[PDB]
Design a protein around this ligand. Structure first.
Ligand SMILES: *[C@@H]1O[C@H](CO)[C@@H](O)[C@H](O)[C@H]1NC(C)=O
Lengths: 49, 49
């Protein structure tokens, strides 16, 4: 049976806050399709050669 | 058929008379008189715009 992720109880209370004391600069890659090959078929030459 | 005949580097085994493409079309021939192996490529074609 598949795991959905690690389980985590966030430390919530009516007067507690967490504040980050540092940071990390992250570089992420996203790849997107933009075009496909421009095919052409001559219908008469495909069908009748 | 109709095409451009040319001498070829295809090593036909002694029992083979034709070569065929993915489309069943004859891609090469053995000449019946002098046993040359000839490629066949179609005569050049394209859209006119
Ligand atoms: C047939 O052609 C080949 C060469 O293409 C030749 O060797 C052979 O002698 C010919 N046979 C006859 C009966 O003409």
């Amino acid at each position: 049976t598949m795991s959905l992720g690690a389980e985590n109880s966030v430390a919530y209370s009516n007067n507690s806050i967490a504040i980050p004391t540092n940071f990390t600069i992250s570089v992420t890659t996203e790849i997107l399709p933009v075009s496909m090959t421009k095919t052409s078929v001559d219908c008469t030459m495909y069908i009748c050669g | 058929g109709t095409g451009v005949l040319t001498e070829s580097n295809k090593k036909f085994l002694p029992f083979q008379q034709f070569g065929r493409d993915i489309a069943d079309t004859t891609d090469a021939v053995r000449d019946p008189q002098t046993l040359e192996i000839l490629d066949i490529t179609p005569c050049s074609f394209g859209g006119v715009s």
